[PDB]
Structure 1
């Protein structure tokens, strides 16, 4: 548990959940928190409020590392794309960059079939 002061907030904003992982510049994870692990199951898990409290709890899992400036890498179409960024900025964090890294295949693999719901 040494001091970093330079982190990256990897937000995995899926349709069903939101996973926030704070790593250093190299990519080694220091702490993480999810919407499902913050007391939300089912319908409450895929909400911007659950993502916000997950970003709040993940920012507390790295208080021993003393991060002052951290990057934001958003990935996924689900809710909590901007809610986690707001919850990270409100937690006393200097957001230096925000980046969308959602994977886009250049017409690669075949996706599953449509749901006849």
Structure 2
């Protein structure tokens, strides 16, 4: 009950399952959601649909906090990425700006077994 009114909408999109974490201008997450939090096991969570439900719920939960506008920050590729976005464009919030803050590293990290 801090009525943030405006904040940021982090979208951790991945091939495993997208996870949304709404926050304020500072960066303190007010609430989050994920396909797993929606009830999905682990294989169906990656679906773009499980991303829409996670985006809307993560949003609605924030509606309670009193937030109206948010800034989406997309990270990492994967199904449900664009789905989570449009899911946010709707709901009860106003997407003021979208940004692809996907890290995509430079040079000094040994890739995992799957990547090597």
Q: Same fold (TM over 0.5)?
A: yes
- Find the aligned partners of 1:112 and 1:22 in 2 and give their Cα distance: 29
Given the two structures, how large is their TM-score scaled by the length of structure 1? 0.91
CA RMSD of aligned residues (A): 1.6
Matched positions, count: 116
Q: How far 1:21 sits from its partner (Å)?
A: 0.2
CA distance in 2 between counterparts of 1:23 and 1:75 reads 15
C-alpha displacement at 1:43, in angstroms?
A: 2.4
Q: Within 2, Cα distance between the matches of 1:91 and 1:36?
A: 20
Asked if 1:41 corresponds to 2:41, the answer is yes
Q: Which runs of 5+ in 2 are unaligned?
A: none
TM-score of the two chains, using structure 2 as the length reference:
0.92
Shift of 1:92: 2.1
- Distance, in Å, in 2 between the alignment partners of 1:112 and 1:100 is 23
Offset from partner CA, 1:5-53 (integer Å, 9 cap, x none): 1110001112111110000011001000001110111321111000000
Partner of 1:93: 93
- Native 8 Å contact 2:5 2:68 kept in 1: yes
Change (3 A) 1:30 1:114: closer
Match of 1:58? 58
Evaluate the alpha carbon distance shift between residue 3 and residue 115 of structure 1 in structure 2; reply closer, same or farther with a 3 A threshold.
Answer: closer
SS state at 1:3 partner: coil
Secondary structure of 2:37's counterpart equals helix
Aligned partners of 1:115 and 1:76: how far apart in 2? 15
Distance between the aligned counterparts of 2:104 and 2:115, measured in 1?
21
**Structure 1 residues without counterparts, runs of 5 or longer:** none
Following superposition, the deviation at residue 95 of structure 1 comes to 0.7
SS at match of 2:53: helix
